[PDB]
């Protein structure tokens, strides 16, 4: 069935949306990978950082964005789509805070973005922008929260997830590591995320070829770890592993 | 380098005079610098020399700890680790007091819990352990 | 092609866009026109065609605001539309700012307007090439605009069917320009049209239009017997 | 009402009375005129409470979104410019006059005054509100360039005390907010901490 | 078959089919099992919440959701379309409440949601909702269980199953369902119907059940679902 | 054909939109525009191609002034480049009208990138067929240089090169200590790089367009003066002879 393939709004005779599936394939096209894990009182996102040139400003190159003061996201997929969806998420969070007087819950922001994407999946006006957004925040009543906002309107919440080329391998690794004492600390969660990326990619990380963002209950502000902190984590945890 | 292997003899003399961990830490810092520079030869000499110093000492509860450490440090160089384990095996065969050498055998085995580049060495260690 | 040239909205798999090239071809279905400029004048000279020996010769020089005239080659519908737009823009500038619209800005407006169709599926690119002659306080200007929405500031240019003869003549003789009397300038333009003409044909008062603008000379179009002082003076081959 | 702002090297102190009348009756007597726009920028509001609050909320939304998008702390000039745009555009509907004072890394210690209309003027010290005039003349004499944070705090306290004393529409407690690199320190002078005759 | 007349929603095929809406219904049938049983004194909805991994936090996204104090809704099909439809149903119920100071009847809510689906199945640039909704309400003094299809058609049901194994579910409900069934027995029947099409171990936290009695619609807590599973087993 | 390469709103069965890739191909067919961010400024150089002796000097400028303090260097369809320059000028004007201060270049790059992404989303419009660079300098933000491409990505840069000779230009830029050079010398380096990458037997005519925005302009972008451009051109020709020798 290849006729039912060029239009986002056409159901295949068995009821499939091939253009949405192709948007997912587009997610698996930036080459990078991202992982996210939540401990007792923190959430961590770690993304592979490729800077294949000396002339490219690594400070500007990034996939971790601060959606609001207390919510962060890691984007994987086409970069233009990633930044467009990041701007949309920031705008939605600002509108929520304006209308309702309190910071947008992470699950609410994910539902808003997923609804926005579902609209494009249903109507035929745009293409479903091919990016995957993993959001992390600290909810006052639930605790640390990690969510995904794939480009079809699906936004389940996660104990630990991955996106990009090696999402399946990272998922298997995190399943194994979470069946055993899912209760992780801050250092243990950073360990688990970094180890998942390193093992799935089959490489040990320099302090620069990796980008980590973190939120904690004690300090519930999205913080992007600096090079010194990344190196400290890598060296200390590899040594004491 | 030659400068490395001439400042290492003074460390050997200090260890013989008695250095529980001071020379150990000095050599660890030196090896950190060399590894970061990615100097495989320097790493190999430093590792073999530190294990040699331990063995020349009493080293009990110290040689095994240093081997565990230098194996579990950052991405040690393949040849460096291979040379260290080969040296430690050649110095393992010439040991006695089996109730105690068993601990060193186990430490070496768990350092070599499996790696394509130390397969034969682990095999010989396992054979010696089986004979014991 | 065959699926990459149906509309302007599809890039061909070569980084090439085909309907714009087809409009740039449509520009060659017009008639020869040569524009050129001295240091104090600008002259457009056009070879007016004829649909029949009874029908008059189609006009090819149009009069934008007093300091600007236009010579058209290509679709006459698009020529009319762009002429109306240019006239409106010049009038708006002379209404808001009590001064003539600069030619280099009028051409930018034309470029934006003509580029908009070349990116959206609601219309076709304006299949008309323009030679805009003008005189602003900077100096005489000759501009060329093509259906691709690209404009070139030319010291002397030619467009239309059988244009390379005139363009080669202009390249050969442009060193003479600038330090030319108006009569010599018009003569050079007429020579360029002679070069683009088929050998058996010749420039007659019936089929030649001559627009001139410059310092102390508001754009004037000479047609029919008005060109006699120019063709008569022109030397013969 | 009465609102004031004084600039000192490295920071700025805002102050405001806490009266909100609806005629001759104090609907609210502990009203918090000072409003934190982003984190360091503060706005002192005067005029109709509804218009001032709506403008402040809209400007807070706009400036928060702008700062998050820029990944940089906002400029006091940017906040006062947003206020100016809104006030000038809706001159005829907004009976609101505002004083935007704060600190930013580039031009720390800034005070702009957007009075009724759409004006945009930086000042070493700005005053607004119904009771402004009296303390306005008084500060014209009292102000001296080069004050420190403590001197500016006492200056603002005395000024607002005079305005409250001589103005029927101003009165209650005096709310102060000192902004600088370290952050924002807000305090209140209730009944006795505020001068008695000066 | 009629191959040409299957890409558009604004053309009848020579035999009269609207093939694209049938394809939407195929998308529905290729979804998670859900069951609805109209007890004598209430209604029960169930649906498997089996996740694709242990990592999916199976407490964040719910499948059996309320729409009013007396109406709830489950689905079989695509989750995003379901989210859209539940939001629209809530909005319609609120509009009805504002106009008439009275909770919307279940029949009326079903009519209006079916009208929404019809709106989405009447153009070429829009894709029909690829879900089937099961609405359960306690309007008046009797329970109501309705189905709404992508085509905009709505049914009243005694008991039904939709999703992957709806045929087996309906045969099982034909065998087991009796009209004079108390809600407590209907919950067991619902869970058993799910079990008959539920692969893996039906743990309390991977199944979602919502009841609707005279006290109003309520999603049973995982502890309650665990108790019901233990009693059934 | 592929069958999925018509309209920028269609994903091929790989996650690839081919219209954007064809736009990238279109930009990777034009003259070369490079830009280097020295310590106290940014310098743009463009190898404009004089396609006829009739065009007067300065025709078809590929260096635009997008706001007073920001320069733009384009490469690709020049009609699209002019339209994007107008869009960026309007965005900077709107920023200065709303917020009251010169637009930060990072924000301007993000806005124009979002516009380009808007045009790559839909099937009723084709993706912009040109890349470009935005350079600026200010006391409080420092020299900045960004590159935008048809897909709409706005990565920052230290040295960038777009057009036919981009890989060679980047190779020749890597061998520069830009982080500690000054404008007066980085301009000469830009001229030399452009002359080296320029192909004389293929592109025939040639004109070097230079511009800088840096401390020595008070953060005001402008075209490099006549004498400075002449000296840089002379140095570039001498360096070409030296490399040949």
Q: Which structural domains are found in chain F, ordered by start? A: 1-239 (3.60.20.10)
Distance from CA of B46 to the nearest CA of A (A): 18
Check: CB of residue E182 under 8 Å from CB of residue E41: yes
- B119-131 and B98-111 helices, crossing angle to 10°: 160
Beta bridge partners of C222: C210
- F183-197 and F226-244 helices, crossing angle to 10°: 50
Q: What is the rounded CA–CA span in Å between residue E74 and residue E93?
A: 16
Q: How many domains are there within chain E?
A: 1
Q: Helix, strand or coil for residue A27?
A: helix
Q: What is the rounded CA–CA span in Å between residue F104 and residue F95?
A: 9
- C3/F119 CB distance under 8 A: no
* Pair of tokens at residue F94: 């709107």
Q: Helix, strand or coil for residue A52?
A: coil
Check: CB of residue F74 under 8 Å from CB of residue F85: yes
Q: What is the rounded CA–CA span in Å between residue E74 and residue F97?
A: 51
Query: Which residues does chain B break after (C to N > 2.5 Å)?
Result: none
Order across the sheet with F144-148: list the strands: F63-65, F70-76, F130-136, F144-148
For chain E, the first-to-last Cα distance in angstroms comes to: 47
CB of A185 within 8 Å of a chain D CB? The answer is no
Identity of the residue in F54, F60, F125 whose CB atom sits nearest the CB atom of C9: F125
Check: CB of residue E149 under 8 Å from CB of residue E28: yes
Per this entry, what is the length of chain D? 198
Minimal CA–CA distance to F197: which of F180, F226, F223, F173? Answer: F173
Q: What is the rounded CA–CA span in Å between residue C182 and residue C166?
A: 19
CB of A100 within 8 Å of a chain D CB? The answer is no
Check: CB of residue A47 under 8 Å from CB of residue A34: yes
- Burial (CB count within 10 angstroms: exposed 0-12, middle 13-18, buried 19+), residue A226: exposed
Q: What is the rounded CA–CA span in Å between residue E152 and residue C191?
A: 76
Q: What is the rounded CA–CA span in Å between residue F49 and residue B5?
A: 62
Minimal CA–CA distance to A79: which of A116, A103, A107, A49? Answer: A49
Q: What is the rounded CA–CA span in Å between residue A211 and residue A203?
A: 15
3-state secondary structure chain C: CCCCCCCCCCCCCCCCCHHHHHHHHHHHHCCCEEEEECCCEEEEEEECCECCCCCCECCCEEECCCCEEEEEEECHHHHHHHHHHHHHHHHHHHHHCCCCCCHHHHHHHHHHHHHHHHCEECECCCCEEEEEEEECCCCEEEEEECCCCCEEEECEEEECCCCHHHHHHHHHHHHHCCCCCHHHHHHHHHHHHHHHCCCCCCCCCCCEEEEEEECCEEEEEECHHHHHHHHCCCCCC
Minimal CA–CA distance to F75: which of F173, F170, F149? Answer: F149
3-state secondary structure D115-182: CCCCCCEECCEEEECCCHHHHHHHHHHHCCCCCCHHHHHHHHHHHHHHHHHHCCCCCCCEEEEEEECC
What backbone torsions phi and psi does residue C149 show, to the nearest 5 degrees? 80, 20
Q: Helix, strand or coil for residue D112?
A: strand
- F4/A84 CB distance under 8 A: no
For chain D, the first-to-last Cα distance in angstroms comes to: 18
Per this entry, what is the length of chain B? 132
User: E16 lies in which domain range?
Assistant: 3-232
User: A205 lies in which domain range?
Assistant: 1-240
Q: What is the rounded CA–CA span in Å between residue D136 and residue D193?
A: 22
> Which chain F positions have a beta carbon within 8 Å of A8's beta carbon?
9
Identity of the residue in A18, A79, A127 whose CB atom sits nearest the CB atom of F121: A127
Q: What is the rounded CA–CA span in Å between residue B78 and residue B115?
A: 10
Q: What is the rounded CA–CA span in Å between residue E131 and residue E129?
A: 6
Q: What is the rounded CA–CA span in Å between residue A191 and residue A236?
A: 10
**C-alpha dihedral, F190 to F196 to F197 to F200, nearest 10°:** 130
Q: What is the rounded CA–CA span in Å between residue F216 and residue F213?
A: 8
Q: Helix, strand or coil for residue A183?
A: coil
Neighbouring C-beta atoms of residue E41, cutoff 10 Å: 15
The DSSP secondary structure of D28-76, one letter per residue, reads ESS----EESSSS-EEEEEE-HHHHHHHHHHHHHHHHHHHHHHTSPPPH
Q: What is the rounded CA–CA span in Å between residue C17 and residue A84?
A: 27
> Which chain A positions have a beta carbon within 8 Å of D68's beta carbon?
66-69, 90, 94
CB of F155 within 8 Å of a chain A CB? The answer is yes
- The CATH number of the domain where E139 resides is what? 3.60.20.10
For chain F, the first-to-last Cα distance in angstroms comes to: 49
Minimal CA–CA distance to E136: which of E31, E62, E48, E211? Answer: E211
Q: Which chains touch B (3 or more CB pairs under 8 A)?
A: A
- Which residue bears the tokens 């199976």? E58
The b/e string for A5-19 (b: 16+ C-beta within 10 A; e otherwise) is bbbbbbbbbebbbbb
* Pair of tokens at residue C192: 């360029």
Distance from CA of A204 to the nearest CA of F (A): 26
Minimal CA–CA distance to A68: which of A156, A145, A16, A135? Answer: A135
> Which chain F positions have a beta carbon within 8 Å of D120's beta carbon?
100
- A90/D71 CB distance under 8 A: no
Identity of the residue in D57, D58, D68 whose CB atom sits nearest the CB atom of A90: D68
> Which chain A positions have a beta carbon within 8 Å of E127's beta carbon?
8-11, 17, 121-124
Minimal CA–CA distance to D95: which of D45, D41, D36? Answer: D45
Maximum Cα interatomic distance, chain B, rounded to a whole number of Å = 42
Antiparallel, parallel or unpaired: β F41-48 and F207-214: antiparallel
Q: What is the rounded CA–CA span in Å between residue A152 and residue E79?
A: 9
* Percentage helix, strand, coil for chain F under 3-state DSSP, each rounded to 5: 40, 20, 35
Order across the sheet with C156-159: list the strands: C156-159, C33-37, C41-47, C208-214, C217-222
Q: What is the rounded CA–CA span in Å between residue D19 and residue A239?
A: 64
3-state secondary structure chain E: CCCHHHCCCCCCCCCCCCHHHHHHHHHHHCCCCEEEEECCCCEEEEEECCCCCCCECCCCCCCCEEEECCEEEEEEECHHHHHHHHHHHHHHHHHHHHHCCCCCCHHHHHHHHHHHHHHHCCCCCECCCCEEEEEEECCCCCCEEEEECCCCCEEECCEEEECCCHHHHHHHHHHHCCCCCCHHHHHHHHHHHHHCCCCCCCCCCCEEEEEEECCEEEECCHHHHHHHHHHHC
Beta bridge partners of D128: D3
Task: Read off the DSSP letter of residue F104.
Answer: P
Q: How many domains are there within chain A?
A: 1
- F11/A25 CB distance under 8 A: yes
Resolution in A: 3.1
> Domains, chain D, ranges and CATH?
1-198 (3.60.20.10)
- Which distant-in-sequence residues (6+ apart) come within 8 Å of A177 by Cβ? A160, A192, A196
Check: CB of residue D115 under 8 Å from CB of residue D76: no
Q: Which of residues 31-60 of D touch A (CB under 8 A)?
A: 57-58, 60
Q: What is the rounded CA–CA span in Å between residue F98 and residue F91?
A: 11
Residue D78 annotated in active site: no
Distance from CA of A60 to the nearest CA of E (A): 32
Q: What is the rounded CA–CA span in Å between residue E96 and residue A163?
A: 43
State which residue of chain A sits closest to B71, comparing Cα positions. Answer: A239
> Which chain A positions have a beta carbon within 8 Å of D54's beta carbon?
none
The b/e string for F13-40 (b: 16+ C-beta within 10 A; e otherwise) is eebbbbbbbbbbbbbbbbbbbbbbbbbb
* Pair of tokens at residue A45: 């996102």
Q: Given phi > 0 = left and psi -120 to 50 = alpha, else beta, which region is E216?
A: left
* Pair of tokens at residue F80: 């699209």
What backbone torsions phi and psi does residue E61 show, to the nearest 5 degrees? -105, 120
- F19/C153 CB distance under 8 A: no
- D132-142 and D149-166 helices, crossing angle to 10°: 140
Q: Do chains A and B touch (3 or more CB pairs under 8 A)?
A: yes
* Pair of tokens at residue E192: 């058993």
Helix (H) or strand (E) holding A77: strand A71-77
Check: CB of residue A70 under 8 Å from CB of residue A105: no
Neighbouring C-beta atoms of residue F2, cutoff 10 Å: 11
* Pair of tokens at residue F185: 């010398």
What backbone torsions phi and psi does residue D183 show, to the nearest 5 degrees? 140, -145
Angstrom CA distances, A32 to A85, C179, F173, stand at 18, 64, 27
Check: CB of residue A185 under 8 Å from CB of residue A103: no
Q: What CATH number belongs to C2-235?
A: 3.60.20.10
Q: What is the rounded CA–CA span in Å between residue E28 and residue F129?
A: 42
- Which distant-in-sequence residues (6+ apart) come within 8 Å of B76 by Cβ? B35, B43, B70
* Pair of tokens at residue D162: 């005079």
Long-range pairs of D118-123 with CB within 8 A, sequence gap ≥ 24: D118/D84, D118/D85, D118/D87, D118/D88, D118/D89, D118/D91, D119/D84, D120/D80, D120/D81, D120/D84, D120/F100, D123/D5, D123/D7
Distance from CA of A200 to the nearest CA of B (A): 17
Neighbouring C-beta atoms of residue D71, cutoff 10 Å: 11
- Which distant-in-sequence residues (6+ apart) come within 8 Å of B74 by Cβ? A204, A234, A235, A238, A239, B35
Minimal CA–CA distance to C63: which of C132, C165, C149? Answer: C132
For chain C, the first-to-last Cα distance in angstroms comes to: 45
Mutate to test the interface with A, among B28, B69, B72, B81 (most CBs of A within 10 A): B72
Neighbouring C-beta atoms of residue D192, cutoff 10 Å: 7
- E6/A13 CB distance under 8 A: yes
- Burial (CB count within 10 angstroms: exposed 0-12, middle 13-18, buried 19+), residue D57: middle
Beta bridge partners of E154: E148
- A153/E59 CB distance under 8 A: no
What backbone torsions phi and psi does residue C214 show, to the nearest 5 degrees? 165, 180
CB of A27 within 8 Å of a chain F CB? The answer is yes
> Which chain C positions have a beta carbon within 8 Å of F80's beta carbon?
115, 119
* Pair of tokens at residue E233: 């087993």
- Which residue bears the tokens 């394809």? E23
- A26/F11 CB distance under 8 A: yes
Q: Given phi > 0 = left and psi -120 to 50 = alpha, else beta, which region is C9?
A: alpha
Long-range pairs of B103-106 with CB within 8 A, sequence gap ≥ 24: B103/B64, B104/B63, B104/B64, B105/B129, B105/B132
Check: CB of residue F178 under 8 Å from CB of residue F41: no
Angstrom CA distances, B44 to B1, B30, B114, stand at 11, 12, 20
Task: Read off the DSSP letter of residue A4.
Answer: G
Identity of the residue in C16, C115, C154 whose CB atom sits nearest the CB atom of F56: C154
**C-alpha dihedral, E166 to E167 to E169 to E174, nearest 10°:** 140
- Which residue bears the tokens 């219209």? F19
- B40-56 and B2-18 helices, crossing angle to 10°: 20
Q: What is the rounded CA–CA span in Å between residue E152 and residue E128?
A: 9
Q: What is the rounded CA–CA span in Å between residue F24 and residue D103?
A: 45
**What does the domain layout of chain C look like in residue ranges?**
2-235
Check: CB of residue A26 under 8 Å from CB of residue A38: no
- Which residue bears the tokens 């688990």? A192
* Percentage helix, strand, coil for chain A under 3-state DSSP, each rounded to 5: 40, 25, 40
* Pair of tokens at residue F88: 């960026």
Q: Which of residues 165-224 of A touch F (CB under 8 A)?
A: none
Check: CB of residue F158 under 8 Å from CB of residue F43: no
- Burial (CB count within 10 angstroms: exposed 0-12, middle 13-18, buried 19+), residue A98: middle
Mutate to test the interface with F, among C15, C42, C140 (most CBs of F within 10 A): C15
Check: CB of residue A160 under 8 Å from CB of residue E165: no
Q: What is the rounded CA–CA span in Å between residue C111 and residue C120?
A: 15
- The CATH number of the domain where A177 resides is what? 3.60.20.10
CB of B75 within 8 Å of a chain A CB? The answer is yes
- Burial (CB count within 10 angstroms: exposed 0-12, middle 13-18, buried 19+), residue E171: middle
Q: How many Cβ contacts (< 8 angstroms) between chains A and F?
A: 97
* Pair of tokens at residue C4: 């990459």
Q: Given phi > 0 = left and psi -120 to 50 = alpha, else beta, which region is E178?
A: beta
- A186-201 and A227-240 helices, crossing angle to 10°: 80
- Which distant-in-sequence residues (6+ apart) come within 8 Å of F20 by Cβ? F8, F120, F127, F150, F151
- Rg of chain D in Å (alpha carbons): 16
Neighbouring C-beta atoms of residue A142, cutoff 10 Å: 15
**C-alpha dihedral, F225 to F231 to F235 to F236, nearest 10°:** 40
């Amino acid at each position: 069935s290849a006729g039912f393939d060029r239009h986002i709004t056409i159901f295949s005779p068995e009821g499939r949306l091939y253009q949405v599936e192709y948007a997912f394939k587009a997610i698996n096209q930036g080459g990078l990978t991202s992982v996210a894990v939540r401990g007792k009182d923190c959430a961590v996102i770690v993304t592979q950082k490729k800077v294949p040139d000396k002339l490219l400003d690594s400070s500007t190159v990034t996939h971790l964005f601060k959606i609001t003061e207390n919510i962060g996201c890691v984007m994987t997929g086409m970069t233009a789509d990633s930044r467009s969806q990041v701007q949309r998420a920031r705008y939605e969070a600002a509108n929520w805070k304006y209308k309702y007087g309190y910071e947008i819950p992470v699950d609410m922001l994910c539902k808003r973005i997923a609804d926005i994407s579902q609209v494009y999946t249903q109507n035929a006006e745009m293409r479903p922008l091919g990016c995957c957004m993993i959001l992390i925040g600290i909810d006052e009543e639930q605790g640390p929260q990690v969510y995904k906002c794939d480009p079809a309107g699906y936004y389940c919440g996660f104990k630990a997830t991955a996106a990009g080329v090696k999402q399946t391998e990272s998922t298997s690794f995190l399943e194994k590591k979470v069946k055993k004492k899912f209760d992780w600390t801050f250092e243990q969660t950073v360990e688990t995320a970094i180890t998942c990326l390193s093992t799935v990619l089959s490489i040990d990380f320099k302090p620069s070829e990796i980008e980590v963002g973190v939120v904690t209950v004690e300090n519930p502000k999205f913080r992007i770890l600096t090079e010194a902190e990344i190196d400290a984590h890598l060296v200390a945890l590899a040594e004491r592993d | 380098s030659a400068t490395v292997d001439q400042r290492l003899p003074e460390c050997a003399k200090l260890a013989k005079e008695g250095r529980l961990q001071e020379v150990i830490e000095t050599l660890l810092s030196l090896e950190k610098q060399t590894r970061t520079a990615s100097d495989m030869v320097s790493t190999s000499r430093i590792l073999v020399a530190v294990v040699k110093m331990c063995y020349e000492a009493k080293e009990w509860d110290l040689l095994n700890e240093n081997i565990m450490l230098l194996s579990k440090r950052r991405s040690q160089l393949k040849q460096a680790v291979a040379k260290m384990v080969q040296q430690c095996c050649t110095y393992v065969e010439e040991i006695t007091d089996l109730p105690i050498k068993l601990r060193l055998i186990d430490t070496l085995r768990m350092v070599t819990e499996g790696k394509i580049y130390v397969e034969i060495e682990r095999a010989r260690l396992t054979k010696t352990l089986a004979t014991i | 092609r065959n699926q990459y040239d149906n509309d302007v909205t599809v890039w061909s798999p070569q980084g090439r866009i085909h309907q714009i090239e087809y409009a740039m071809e449509a520009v060659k279905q017009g008639s020869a026109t040569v524009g050129l400029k001295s240091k104090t004048h600008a002259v457009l000279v056009a070879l007016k065609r004829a649909q029949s020996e009874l029908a008059a010769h189609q006009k090819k020089i149009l009069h934008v605001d007093n300091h600007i005239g236009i010579s058209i080659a290509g679709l006459t519908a698009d020529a009319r539309l762009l002429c109306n737009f240019m006239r409106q823009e010049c009038l708006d500038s002379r209404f808001v700012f009590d001064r003539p619209l600069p030619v280099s800005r009028l051409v930018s407006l034309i470029g934006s307007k003509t580029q908009i169709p070349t990116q959206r599926y609601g219309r076709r690119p304006y299949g008309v090439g323009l030679l805009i002659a003008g005189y602003d306080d900077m100096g005489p200007h000759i501009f060329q605009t093509c259906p691709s929405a690209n404009y070139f500031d030319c010291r002397a240019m030619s467009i239309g069917a059988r244009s390379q003869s005139a363009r080669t003549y202009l390249e050969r003789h442009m060193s003479e320009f600038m330090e030319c009397n108006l009569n010599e300038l018009v003569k050079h333009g007429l020579r360029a049209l002679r070069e683009t003409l088929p050998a058996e044909q010749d420039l007659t008062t019936k089929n030649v239009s001559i627009g001139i603008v410059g310092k102390d000379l508001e754009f004037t179009i000479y047609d029919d017997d008005d060109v006699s002082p120019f063709l008569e003076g022109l030397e013969e081959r | 009402t009465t609102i004031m702002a004084v600039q000192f090297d490295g920071g700025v102190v805002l102050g405001a009375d806490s009266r909100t009348t609806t005629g001759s009756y104090i609907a609210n007597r502990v009203t918090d005129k000072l409003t934190p726009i982003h984190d360091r920028i503060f706005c002192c509001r005067s005029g109709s409470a509804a218009d001032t609050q709506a403008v402040a909320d809209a400007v807070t939304y706009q400036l928060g979104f702008h700062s998050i998008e820029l990944n940089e702390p906002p400029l006091v000039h940017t906040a006062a410019s947003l206020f100016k745009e809104m006030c000038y555009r809706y001159r005829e509907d907004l009976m609101a006059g505002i004083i935007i004072a704060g600190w930013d890394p580039q031009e720390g210690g800034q005070v702009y005054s957007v009075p009724m209309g759409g004006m945009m003027v930086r000042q070493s010290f700005a005053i607004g509100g119904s009771g402004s005039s009296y303390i306005y003349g008084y500060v014209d004499a009292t102000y001296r360039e080069g004050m420190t944070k403590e001197e500016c705090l006492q200056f603002t306290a005395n000024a607002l005390a005079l305005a409250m004393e001589r103005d029927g529409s101003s009165g209650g407690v005096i709310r102060l907010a000192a902004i600088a690199e370290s952050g924002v320190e807000r305090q209140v002078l209730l009944g006795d901490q505020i001068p008695k005759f000066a | 078959a009629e191959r040409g007349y299957s890409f558009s929603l604004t053309t009848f095929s020579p035999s009269g089919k609207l093939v694209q809406i049938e394809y939407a219904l195929a998308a529905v049938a290729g979804g998670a099992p859900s069951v609805g049983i109209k007890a004598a004194n209430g209604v029960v909805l169930a649906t498997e919440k089996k996740q694709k991994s242990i990592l999916y936090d199976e407490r964040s996204v719910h499948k059996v959701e309320p729409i009013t104090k007396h109406i709830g809704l489950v689905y079989s099909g695509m989750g995003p379309d379901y989210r859209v439809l539940v939001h629209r149903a809530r909005k319609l119920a609120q509009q009805y409440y504002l106009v008439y100071q009275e909770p919307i009847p279940t029949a009326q809510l079903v009519q209006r949601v079916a009208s929404v689906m019809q709106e989405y199945t009447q153009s070429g640039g829009v894709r029909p909702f690829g879900v089937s909704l099961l609405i359960c309400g306690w309007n008046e003094g009797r329970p109501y269980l309705f189905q709404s299809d992508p085509s905009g058609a709505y049914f009243a049901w005694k008991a039904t199953a939709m999703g992957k194994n709806y045929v087996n579910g309906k045969t099982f409900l034909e065998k087991r369902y009796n009209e004079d069934l108390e809600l407590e027995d209907a919950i067991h029947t619902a869970i058993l119907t799910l079990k008959e099409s539920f692969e893996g171990q039906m743990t309390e936290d991977n199944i979602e059940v919502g009841i609707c009695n005279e006290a109003g619609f309520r999603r049973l807590t995982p502890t309650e679902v665990k108790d019901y599973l233990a009693a059934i087993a | 054909g592929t069958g999925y390469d018509l309209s920028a709103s269609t994903f091929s069965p790989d996650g690839r939109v081919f219209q954007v890739e064809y736009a990238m191909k279109a930009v990777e067919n034009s003259s070369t525009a490079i830009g280097i961010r020295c310590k106290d400024g940014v310098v743009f150089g463009v190898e404009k191609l004089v396609l006829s002796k009739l065009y007067e000097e300065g025709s078809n400028k590929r260096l635009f002034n997008v706001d007073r303090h920001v320069g733009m260097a384009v490469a690709g369809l020049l009609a699209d480049a002019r339209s994007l320059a107008d869009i960026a000028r309007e965005e900077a004007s709107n920023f200065r009208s709303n917020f009251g201060y010169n637009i930060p270049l990072k924000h301007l790059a993000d806005r124009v990138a979002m516009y380009v992404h808007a045009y790559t989303l839909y099937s009723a419009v084709r993706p912009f067929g040109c890349s470009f660079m935005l350079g600026s300098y200010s006391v409080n933000d420092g020299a900045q240089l960004y590159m935008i491409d048809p897909s709409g990505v706005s990565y920052g840069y230290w040295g960038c090169a777009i057009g036919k000779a981009r890989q060679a230009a980047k190779t020749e830029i890597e061998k520069l200590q830009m982080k500690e050079m000054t404008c007066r010398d980085i301009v000469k380096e830009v001229a030399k790089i452009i002359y080296i990458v320029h192909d004389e037997v293929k592109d025939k005519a040639f004109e070097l367009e230079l511009s800088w925005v840096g401390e020595l302009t008070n953060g005001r972008h402008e075209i490099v003066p006549k004498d400075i451009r002449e000296e840089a051109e002379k140095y570039a020709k001498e360096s070409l002879k030296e490399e040949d020798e």
